[PDB]
Scaffold this motif. Structure first.
Motif, mmCIF file in Angstrom:
data_model
loop_
_atom_site.group_PDB
_atom_site.id
_atom_site.type_symbol
_atom_site.label_atom_id
_atom_site.label_comp_id
_atom_site.label_asym_id
_atom_site.label_seq_id
_atom_site.Cartn_x
_atom_site.Cartn_y
_atom_site.Cartn_z
ATOM 1 N N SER A 5 0.399 -1.111 -0.084
ATOM 2 C CA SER A 5 0.136 -0.219 0.336
ATOM 3 C C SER A 5 0.473 1.173 -0.239
ATOM 4 O O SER A 5 1.806 1.307 0.573
ATOM 5 C CB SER A 5 -0.890 0.262 0.888
ATOM 6 O OG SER A 5 -2.137 1.180 1.053
ATOM 7 N N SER A 6 0.393 2.359 -0.616
ATOM 8 C CA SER A 6 1.105 3.546 -0.484
ATOM 9 C C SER A 6 0.832 4.580 0.301
ATOM 10 O O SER A 6 1.361 5.244 0.763
ATOM 11 C CB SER A 6 0.878 4.138 -2.205
ATOM 12 O OG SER A 6 -1.007 4.619 -2.160
ATOM 13 N N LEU A 7 -0.167 4.054 1.413
ATOM 14 C CA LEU A 7 -0.034 4.911 2.580
ATOM 15 C C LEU A 7 1.388 4.875 3.953
ATOM 16 O O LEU A 7 1.253 6.143 3.720
ATOM 17 C CB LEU A 7 -1.850 3.775 3.534
ATOM 18 C CG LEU A 7 -2.617 5.296 4.847
ATOM 19 N N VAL A 8 1.383 3.885 3.592
ATOM 20 C CA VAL A 8 2.651 2.934 5.203
ATOM 21 C C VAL A 8 3.859 2.685 5.003
ATOM 22 O O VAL A 8 3.363 2.108 3.897
ATOM 23 C CB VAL A 8 1.531 3.310 6.180
ATOM 24 C CG1 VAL A 8 0.780 3.672 6.969
ATOM 25 C CG2 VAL A 8 1.802 1.968 6.547
ATOM 26 N N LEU A 9 4.712 3.061 4.861
ATOM 27 C CA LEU A 9 6.063 2.782 4.353
ATOM 28 C C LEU A 9 5.951 1.653 4.467
ATOM 29 O O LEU A 9 5.699 0.932 5.241
ATOM 30 C CB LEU A 9 7.334 3.649 4.711
ATOM 31 C CG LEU A 9 8.721 2.641 3.813
ATOM 32 C CD1 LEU A 9 9.166 3.140 2.849
ATOM 33 C CD2 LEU A 9 9.897 2.944 5.154
ATOM 34 N N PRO A 10 6.250 0.344 3.432
ATOM 35 C CA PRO A 10 6.252 -1.134 3.712
ATOM 36 C C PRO A 10 7.487 -1.256 4.165
ATOM 37 O O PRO A 10 8.774 -1.084 4.713
ATOM 38 C CB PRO A 10 6.353 -1.530 2.165
ATOM 39 C CG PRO A 10 5.447 -0.393 1.533
ATOM 40 C CD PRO A 10 5.991 0.656 1.942
ATOM 41 N N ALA A 11 7.606 -2.357 5.392
ATOM 42 C CA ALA A 11 8.850 -3.240 5.630
ATOM 43 C C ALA A 11 9.413 -4.045 4.870
ATOM 44 O O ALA A 11 10.406 -3.960 5.545
ATOM 45 C CB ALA A 11 7.855 -4.743 6.719
ATOM 46 N N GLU A 12 8.771 -4.368 3.985
ATOM 47 C CA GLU A 12 9.971 -4.398 2.715
ATOM 48 C C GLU A 12 10.672 -3.674 1.810
ATOM 49 O O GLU A 12 11.425 -4.217 1.099
ATOM 50 C CB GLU A 12 8.841 -5.003 1.637
ATOM 51 C CG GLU A 12 8.005 -6.310 1.585
ATOM 52 C CD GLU A 12 6.551 -6.053 2.657
ATOM 53 O OE1 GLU A 12 6.764 -5.009 2.909
ATOM 54 O OE2 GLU A 12 6.208 -7.521 2.678
#
Length: 113
Positions: A5-12
């Motif tokens: 998702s573009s909302l919050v920075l992914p753990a990846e």
């Protein structure tokens, strides 16, 4: 397909200094990113005809989306360093991993096909 998702920075992914000459920061993989992973929607202001064409069915330009952590992903200067492609879902813009992306590699986006 994995969906980031573009909302919050992914753990990846993380943000660090871009391997590319002009722009300062960039997005780097933190884990393996599988082939086909889709990230978005890329959000922004709609501009009449960081910016992407939104296309009509006939391949003409309908408008531009002008800008998320996704705004930190720099543009691939060529196909060799490109590992994300812009894909349009309805009238929404996603980035899609062309292939599997190894850890600690910069995410670089451009047009596909």
């Amino acid at each position: 397909v994995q969906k980031l998702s573009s909302l919050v920075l992914p753990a990846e992914v993380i943000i660090a200094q871009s391997s590319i000459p002009g722009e300062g920061l960039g997005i780097f993989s933190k884990t393996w990113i599988k082939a086909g992973t889709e990230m978005g929607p890329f959000t922004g202001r709609v501009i009449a005809p960081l910016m992407w064409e939104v296309f009509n069915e006939d391949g003409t330009v309908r408008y531009f989306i002008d800008a998320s952590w996704m705004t930190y992903i720099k543009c691939a200067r060529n196909e060799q360093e490109q590992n994300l492609e812009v894909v349009q879902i309805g009238t929404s813009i996603f980035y899609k991993a062309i292939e599997m992306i190894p850890p600690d590699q910069e995410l670089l986006v451009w047009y596909g096909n």
